[PDB]
Design a protein around this ligand. Structure first.
Ligand SMILES: CCCCCCCCCC
Lengths: 259, 259
């Protein structure tokens, strides 16, 4: 089953999609999915929609919302900061916990790229009530990526206009100010439940090396990695996305439907 | 106001969004928006969403749905053909005409890229009940574009396995066969009401020359062209998308709110 949903808080409306399995009644595991920077709840080549459908077939529900300033949700992209998306995510978790079909002890988080950074942070903040975590090419070095640009052209453009054009999106100076103060690696450290990282070797947006840091610096033996050979950042082929979705579904089926 | 909407016909469910202006009540002009090949109802850098919001402010509502096989709607991409998207468009027009806030004589069509080809055809099929037409880089040469793509890129796999991977999407042989039988220029010819074409000069997906053909071969003096200098296919900058949205909003404001 697929139904559209909304959240309204602080005068902000988030719009999303909720998937519940047709077969099983009662309370079910739920996966919350976080899209990345300039992405949206559907994500690249619909990989999020696919994931939800692949999950409901194993009796796992899911919700996917567009962050404020993106896609179907209200707001201008210029109003968005990483911290504001964090607050959106805290409200989304609250919404999932309020649904009468949600099993409170079976809630997982999934995040792609910058959504992986968010998912990491949220996982830590609620480490005792988030059952499992999947990270897809998680952009934990996002602060560093924004910082390096200070000496390049986007830095000079930001210094002059207070915003930059990243391809039909207005990236505010407020985002640079906000993100410069955060260390995703440290803010994600301390999550003890099982973690799955899926990463491509040819990822030219978040290099594969980043995942090594996460394995070394953020988690212990509870974290494991699926390497998708030859894959680009968003797993943009049928075989690459099939591998990502199947490994992640099996991880959530093992980790959420056991407890 | 923005609300999620659905259509179900012949065992298929389409999912979309409906925008109505808050201040004006009664029947209002309505714009139907058609996304392009591998796109979705939000479209590139949220330009469709923005276009809907810009329309609300001038008292024009809108609907944007994902075609069957894309985005939030049902179905796999392999099930989609150009003709199935035409049938979806006919059902979406039907849906708009059933809404009690729709002024039946004030319905306009907008299409981007392959969706513009959709709009061009639908406008002709309903030439007496479609009040105005906007085409954004309309891909009337889509049969030729796909034919060139098979000959140079797809290859034997299409014959051996029946499909090709176009970037996380399974493009079926049926689409190639179906689209080869259609002439978008001929099927759109005969629409007499006002038409706006917006096109970028550096468009590398649908060459600017195509718009020249549409002005000469498809429409008469009822058609007008806004050229956006240096712009790419989806007008992917703040300046380019502002120009496209404002020109289209003022065109729909003049042509739907008159007569
Ligand atoms: C991976 C991030 C791509 C966009 C970065 C833009 C940097 C702006 C700095 C002023």
């Amino acid at each position: 089953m697929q139904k559209a949903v909304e959240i309204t808080y602080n005068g902000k409306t988030l719009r999303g999609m909720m998937h519940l399995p047709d077969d099983v009644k009662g309370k079910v595991p739920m996966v919350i999915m976080f899209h990345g920077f300039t992405g949206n709840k559907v994500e690249s080549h619909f990989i999020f929609v696919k994931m939800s459908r692949a999950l409901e077939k194993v009796g796992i529900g899911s919700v996917r919302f567009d962050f404020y300033g993106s896609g179907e949700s209200d707001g201008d992209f210029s109003e968005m900061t990483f911290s504001s998306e964090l607050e959106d995510a805290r409200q989304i978790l609250k919404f999932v916990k309020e649904q009468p079909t949600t099993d409170p002890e079976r809630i997982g988080l999934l995040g792609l790229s910058m959504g992986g950074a968010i998912a990491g942070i949220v996982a830590r903040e609620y480490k005792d009530e988030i059952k499992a975590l999947v990270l897809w090419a998680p952009a934990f070095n996002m602060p560093e990526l924004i910082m390096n640009e200070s000496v390049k052209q986007y830095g000079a453009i930001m210094e002059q206009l207070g915003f930059v054009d990243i391809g039909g999106h207005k990236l505010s100076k407020d985002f640079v100010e906000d993100i410069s103060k955060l260390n995703i690696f440290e803010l994600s450290k301390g999550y003890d439940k099982k973690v799955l990282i899926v990463h491509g070797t040819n990822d030219e947006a978040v290099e594969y090396k980043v995942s090594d840091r996460i394995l070394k610096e953020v988690y212990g033996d509870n974290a494991t990695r699926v390497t998708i050979e030859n894959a680009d950042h968003t797993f943009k082929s049928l075989e690459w996305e099939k591998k990502a979705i199947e490994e992640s579904v099996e991880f959530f089926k093992k980790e959420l439907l056991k407890g």
